[PDB]
Amino acid sequence: HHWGYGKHNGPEHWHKDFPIAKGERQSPVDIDTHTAKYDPSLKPLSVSYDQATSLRILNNGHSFKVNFDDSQDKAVLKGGPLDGTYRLTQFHFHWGSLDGQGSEHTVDKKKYAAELHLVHWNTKYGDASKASQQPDGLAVLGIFLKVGSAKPGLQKVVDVLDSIKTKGKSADFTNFDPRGLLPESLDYWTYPGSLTTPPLNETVTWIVLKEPISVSSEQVLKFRKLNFNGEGEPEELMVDNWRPAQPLKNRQIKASFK
Ligand SMILES: N=C(N)NC(=N)NCc1ccc(S(N)(=O)=O)cc1
Ligand SMILES: [Zn+2]
């Protein structure tokens, strides 16, 4: 009875096996744009992805994920609210059954069709496992997806999805450039939070970009053809793999922009 997104194993059940689900620093959250405070002390974010080395793409039964070579400082996130250097290790997405839902974060209660998470770890802790347990160990760059014009830099991803339809399947996925997934503006909101799946560790500095990327209907429809189930199990489409907004509690969301 492993965690998932169904009626019997979804977000409202997670606290039983991961009690921090009811913690003080859980993610995602609703971003109230009129309560978020502009912080003139914040730096421009530095997203340095030119030397990224993608390795493989996997369906893990909860999303699909592209792993990167993080054995040296190839693709890093710096600046903004961060102190030190954060190495890109993986990206994945959350998405909906319909275009009107799918994001984890919301903006003035608005849901987007999907949300991209670029996951980074603080190099001062040496490896991602150790970093994941530290209060300033991880930084997730979150990017909203809306449906409209196609995103050309996403097409290589959606064309490989037919090869990883079911849980446990992986494929080679070298030479993918994550710069092709970024919007024009790096304006962002930031707040201290958590992983949005089990184990829900409260170890993430969230950086959520204000500007969504557009993807086509055809692109997001291909996400929805993935399966939660393994090969030779009854088919259950991988859709609505998002955690709802959690209580903000004693946190302030800061804006990088006026
Ligand atoms: N359940 C796991 N395999 N997850 C794990 N340890 N990966 C850690 C992990 C990384 C990022 C995110 S997210 N959605 O906040 O960006 C969730 C979980
Ligand atoms: Zn995520």
Author numbering: 3 to 260
Paper text:
CA XII-mimic is an engineered CA II with a modified sequence constructed to mimic the CAXII active site. We determined the X-ray crystallographic structures of hCA II and hCA XII-mimic in the complex with inhibitor 5b. The inhibitor presents the classical binding mode of the sulfonamide moiety in the active site of the two isoforms by directly interacting with the zinc ion and forming hydrogen bonds with Thr199/198 (numbering of hCA II and hCA XII, respectively). On the other hand, different hydrogen bonds and water bridge interactions are established within the active site of the two enzymes, resulting in two different orientations of the inhibitor tail. In contrast, in the hCAXII–5b complex, the inhibitor interacts with the amino acid residues in the opposite region of the protein cavity. Indeed, the nitrogen atoms of the biguanide group establish water bridges with Thr199 and His64. By analyzing the mutations in the active site of hCAXII-mimic with respect to the hCA II isoform, we realized that the Asn67Lys variation in the hCA XII-mimic amino acid sequence is the only one that could influence the binding mode of the inhibitor. Lysine is more flexible and bulkier than asparagine, which may induce a different organization of the inhibitor within the enzyme cavity due to steric hindrance. The inhibitor tail in hCA II forms a water bridge with Asn67, whereas in hCA XII-mimic it is oriented in the opposite direction of Lys67. Noteworthily, the Asn67Lys mutation in the hCA XII-mimic was found to be mainly responsible for driving 5b toward the tumor associated isoform over the cytosolic hCA II.
